[PDB]
Amino acid sequence: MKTEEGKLVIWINGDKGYNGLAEVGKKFEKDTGIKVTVEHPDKLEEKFPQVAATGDGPDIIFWAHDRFGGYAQSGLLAEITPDKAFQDKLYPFTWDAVRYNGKLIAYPIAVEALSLIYNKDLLPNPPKTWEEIPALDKELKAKGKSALMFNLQEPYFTWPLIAADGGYAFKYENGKYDIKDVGVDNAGAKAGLTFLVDLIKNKHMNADTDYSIAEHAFNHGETAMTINGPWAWSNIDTSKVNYGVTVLPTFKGQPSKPFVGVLSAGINAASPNKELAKEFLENYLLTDEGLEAVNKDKPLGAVALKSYEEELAKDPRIAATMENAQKGEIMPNIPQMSAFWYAVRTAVINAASGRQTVDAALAAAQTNAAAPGLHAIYGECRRLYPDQPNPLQVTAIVKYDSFGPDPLDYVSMYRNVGSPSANIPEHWHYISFGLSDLYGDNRVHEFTGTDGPSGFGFELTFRLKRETGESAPPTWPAELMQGLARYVFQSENTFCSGDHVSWHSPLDNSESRIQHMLLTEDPQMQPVQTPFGVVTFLQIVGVCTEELHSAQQWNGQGILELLRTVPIAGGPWLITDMRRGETIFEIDPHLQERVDKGIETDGSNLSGVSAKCAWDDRTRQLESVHLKFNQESGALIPLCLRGRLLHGRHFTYKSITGDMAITFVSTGVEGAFATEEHPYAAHGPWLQILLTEEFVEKMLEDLEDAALPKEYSWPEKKLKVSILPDVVHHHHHH
């Protein structure tokens, strides 16, 4: 039982008639006593799903219908249950628009479509074609004016042109959408966007033009035309500009196809006020007086409510709205629409800016829209960088699924301001895409469904100290990441925090002393759930050979902590400074003593290493054994023996090329199948050999590396160090 009064929090976009809605709420409060608070937060379509998870979202959310299926699929919307009479009061197509999986998930409010708006004084006869506009602009330019200005930051406004010659979102056939058939990279879409980019190239439009600039331009009479919706008209009236609303220009002898939106009001599933919300929406808003109150503030367009529609249908602006809505298509409401919108937004901005060609932009958008794992990761990125919607990205020209050299399809580069209070410097943040399962169609990775690791289950990241004067992030770390990715795919070994990676060249191909890498959990990036699995984020940390050796001999985690305690060497977020000239040991002499104390008392943390090695003469015992290593692995043999066997621990060399492994074991440890009685044993290519403390000590005495090939022998066994005979191949995760 509830002994309390409810309330209503309402979200509506800032370009809509929210004061009129507040007036309808004021009337609701008068009649009912229930307060109604109308808010118009920025990015409310992105915030709503964020806040609903906290339980702090509104009772009612207004938006175009295309977003609501995603919210619904995510369980964020209450099913709406109007009786037949009320359903009868609104047009069937709009109910259709607000229908998801056989349920009504919102109340439809109004039909929106873009139209050509034009200044009758500057232009008494508006152009019937897009092709006319460049010529018209020159004329208007002669007298200090422009032909057309509109919002190029939202793909919504450019889409009518893109769709004109045959661009589409998802193909509608036999009552449903095909989520893999996307029409953004077809000739018609390329043609439309190419036309837009040509308009910008020839200086008839500017790529940076946004909503407010276009609005100011048209409302001050600085531009002859604009493209906008009904909501925009109230402000034009105020400007006292003599304007007309007409059909959008044709492209290639075809009508522009704007996406038709139905302004809809959904009820939060977590709301304790669903009835008050129903009452408000049905009996107060969706009436002549309510919609009139909202429309007076900012025109809604063609309202779903018949009575007010016949009343507003007289308006030739609404007639024009409906002509353009008619010639266009209603937006799908399927969940994949937000990924699709992100994809198209980036393509239009990048093509218009000249950052990318139309072909590359739309190809990425086409692939991008069909890509859930990517969209999940991008989601995390967006959470981290609200300020940077469009990052600089390194894109693989030929993708890995077609056997291009680079397995990371994309590498995003962000500018991270760090924390000046925390003494964390500014730096560039690289994030990779490809080691996880982006697309889930098994082109590169095996798809097993939700839960478990997505692809290898992680993505690589890197933090590079920003140098003074640097306008953009350097791109070499991307190639570095590609190298690491190539290793991961070929070797089949997943990376873990605490691991090290011997590279043996300065990472940036400079003279830098940073020639090696440690791997740790990214300090900011949180693991993500994708339909294809979970993704964690492994940050790369550049180190000196001395530090690598210390990580090997002692442990990686310790060295990482030391690196955190020394800011110029990493700090809390373990940022890499390629120009760093001293090891942490040169910075604090005594610290080395701490490692040395650690090594002698605790030994090495390294369970094993992947290296060039082999062994030779179904569980099998062997009378003789012959072990083979390369120099580097050979240099770790002393670590294996002294560092672990003498501490009652085991050590494993695993070959990356073959399926072989060699595990050194000492007396005890239970788990070993190698007994002193039978020293050498093998489970296939896995070889386990048991060595005694006495023999370990003796072995340590014998080994002092010398020129190759170098040979060691005993009556039972031989040990070779070789010049990389070890040679000749796995692709993908198939």
Binding site: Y487, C496, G498, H500, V501, H504, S610
Partner: peptide, 8 residues
């Protein structure tokens, strides 16, 4: 706890 050598 693991080492990967000469990944290049």
């Amino acid at each position: 706890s693991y080492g990967h050598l000469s990944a290049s």
